[PDB]
């Protein structure tokens, strides 16, 4: 009664110290449900509260990327609130997204707190549907299937937005970036799955190279159907013998598999926001590193050519062209250190590119002021800056309060992906050792090495 | 109407703060659970209603 | 008066920690205002 | 900026994003109150 150890919420009952206390939940399906739903509330809370904070701080006439925004860029990329060139025409859609997430987080938090402290601690006595045993392989694949179906619907919501509810922001739209309705999504599997077999190295870039919204939307049509089909599959089947023999079947093992999965996705997202300027439009996120470096070469090409330079024939100090040179396969590219960035592609630059690379005739005659503007802007918003948000190279003096959203998003998600790989190793190794029965140490009376022949 | 709207949203903020403290306390309190359960229902229904009131009233000041 | 545990240690720790957070937060505020702000 | 009708709630909106951090801190207050048992 009046005893501190009288509950099962201590090391004495559970075998786990307070600093591993959430492991006490492994076999308490009800409270563990509470923990998960409450945690979902925290995610949704942040999405809502952070959007309202961003909107309250938002000056619509400054670029988003001058304002430390990462969520409003996500909403704008879906075509909400913006017009030609990414200009903000209406902030109310940002407000709605923020409010509805914040209100929804209250419902999730309510259910989480209920299940965590007031509801039934285990679900199995209460419901055969919601109860589960981690070692019940069929129940596990059924719950996986439910969530696969939910994820497929989610992918089809993006498609629905792109095709029937206003479209998406298209940085590549002919005549300038603009919101565009996608009517011909790419369904050809040779294109969609071709992305998955591209090398991740330079000039290829695996799926990070996706460069048009038709492929994006068609890809999500495929992922939607694949996930719904796989979900139906896993509700109607149980694991084959070869799978049963290959895997560890425990809650901690399943957690470890998902940690390895999320780590991989985190590293992928890091590269996506660093290199891709289609689903991360530079109008909202700022230029990529490659983009800003190319924009500097473009800027001084324009300036020096205006002064009378023949930029095609100008030999730089090394013997390579000061402004223009060849890639290792012959394409005409910008010179200087930005020779490394010749795989870059962006809508302000492509009008100057022909079958042989950069076209000297177009460079001499057809560079428009909006291209000079965009190159100057992007050169001066390169994703370089200090931890206290002093923009520029590390030797820059204080003045410009700037760190690119691309740098914030790349660094955070590398840090997170890395620790999640560590978590995968931790929990995968522990799940193996626990399934085999030696996660608490070596049995003194049955030490395996003592029964092995010496090595020499 | 602008003040009336501001009142309903203020009520929602205050009711929210009362629920944020009151619900976990009630859920983990031994005595008076019968009275607590009825109040949590009342607060929850009033909360939902105030969200709808603020949502509707939004379109008369924005 | 001198008996230990009249004021629960968990309250001592919580209030003391909040005090540390407040004072450190003040120092970070001062990095953006007044001397040392670059402004 | 928020729509002007909501402007009076600006200081509240400024502080809400940090609340998730408070939940991690709250776990330690709670654990201290049960003696880290």
């Amino acid at each position: 009664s009046n005893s501190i150890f009288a509950t099962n919420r201590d090391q004495e009952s559970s075998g786990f110290a307070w600093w591993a206390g959430n492991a006490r939940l492994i076999n308490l399906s009800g409270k563990l449900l509470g923990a998960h739903v409450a945690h979902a509330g925290l995610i949704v809370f942040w999405a809502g509260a952070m959007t309202l904070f961003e909107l309250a701080h938002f000056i619509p006439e400054k670029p988003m990327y001058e304002q430390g925004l990462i969520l409003i860029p996500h909403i704008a990329t879906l075509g909400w609130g913006v017009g030609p060139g990414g200009e903000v025409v209406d902030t109310f859609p940002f407000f709605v997204v923020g409010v509805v997430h914040l209100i929804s987080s209250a419902v999730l938090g309510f259910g989480g707190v209920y299940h965590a402290i007031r509801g039934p601690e285990t679900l199995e006595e209460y419901s055969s549907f919601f109860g589960y045993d981690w070692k019940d392989k069929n129940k596990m694949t059924t719950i996986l299937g439910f969530h696969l179906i939910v994820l497929g619907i989610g992918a089809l919501l993006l498609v629905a937005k792109a095709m029937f509810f206003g479209g998406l922001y298209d940085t590549w739209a002919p005549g300038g970036g603009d919101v565009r309705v996608i009517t011909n999504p790419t369904l050809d599997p040779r294109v969609i799955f071709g992305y998955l077999l591209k090398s991740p190295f330079g000039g290829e870039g695996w799926i990070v190279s996706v460069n048009n919204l038709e492929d994006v939307v068609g890809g999500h049509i495929w992922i939607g159907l694949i996930c719904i089909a796989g979900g139906i599959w896993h509700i109607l089947t149980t694991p084959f013998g070869w799978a049963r023999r290959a895997f560890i079947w425990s809650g901690e093992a399943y957690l470890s598999y998902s940690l390895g999965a999320l780590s991989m996705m985190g590293f992928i997202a890091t590269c996506f926001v660093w290199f891709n300027n289609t689903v991360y439009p530079s109008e909202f996120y700022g230029p990529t590193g490659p983009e800003a470096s190319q924009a500097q070469a473009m800027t001084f090409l324009i300036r020096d050519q205006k002064l009378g330079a023949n930029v095609g024939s100008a030999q730089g100090p090394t013997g390579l062209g000061k402004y223009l040179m060849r890639s290792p396969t012959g394409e005409i590219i910008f010179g200087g250190e930005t020779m490394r960035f010749w795989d870059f592609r962006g809508p302000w630059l492509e009008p100057l590119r022909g079958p042989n690379g950069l076209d000297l005739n177009k460079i001499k005659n057809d560079i428009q002021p909006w291209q000079e503007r965009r190159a100057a802007e992007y050169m001066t918003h390169a994703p370089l800056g200090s931890l206290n948000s002093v923009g520029g190279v590390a030797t820059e003096i204080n003045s410009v309060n700037f760190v690119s959203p691309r740098s914030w998003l790349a660094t955070s998600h590398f840090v997170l992906a890395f620790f999640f790989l560590v978590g995968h190793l931790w929990h995968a190794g522990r799940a193996r050792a626990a399934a085999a029965g030696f996660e608490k140490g070596i049995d003194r009376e049955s030490e395996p090495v003592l029964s092995m022949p010496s090595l020499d | 109407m602008t003040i009336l709207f501001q009142l309903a949203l203020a009520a929602l903020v205050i009711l929210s703060f009362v629920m944020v403290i009151g619900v976990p306390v009630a859920y983990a309190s031994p005595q008076d659970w019968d009275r607590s359960k009825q109040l949590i229902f009342l607060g929850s229904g009033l909360w939902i209603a105030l969200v709808l009131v603020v949502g509707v009233l939004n379109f008369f000041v924005v | 008066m001198s008996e230990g545990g009249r004021i629960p240690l968990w309250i001592v720790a919580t209030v003391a920690g909040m005090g540390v957070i407040v004072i450190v937060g003040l120092f970070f505020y001062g990095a953006y205002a007044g001397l040392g702000s670059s402004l | 900026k928020l729509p002007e009708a909501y402007a009076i709630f600006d200081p509240l909106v400024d502080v809400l994003p940090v609340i998730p951090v408070l939940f991690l801190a709250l776990a330690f207050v709670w654990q201290a109150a049960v003696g880290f048992r």
């Binding site: 509950t7 402290i117 | 703060f17 944020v20 403290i21 976990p24 306390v25 983990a28 309190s29 031994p30 005595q31 | 629960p8 968990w10 309250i11 919580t14 909040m18 | 600006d10 200081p11 509240l12 400024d14 502080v15 940090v18 609340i19 408070l22 939940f23 801190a25 709250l26 207050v29 709670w30 109150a33 049960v34």
Partner: peptide
């Protein structure tokens, strides 16, 4: 704006420990 901000975060910040304290005195299910 700064007096309002500090008051909000003070009321929000006390709420958490206030829940623990109220349950501790009531000998609740901590």
């Amino acid at each position: 704006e700064v007096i309002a901000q500090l008051t909000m975060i003070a009321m929000i910040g006390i709420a958490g420990p206030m829940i623990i304290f109220l349950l501790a005195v009531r000998r609740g299910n901590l």
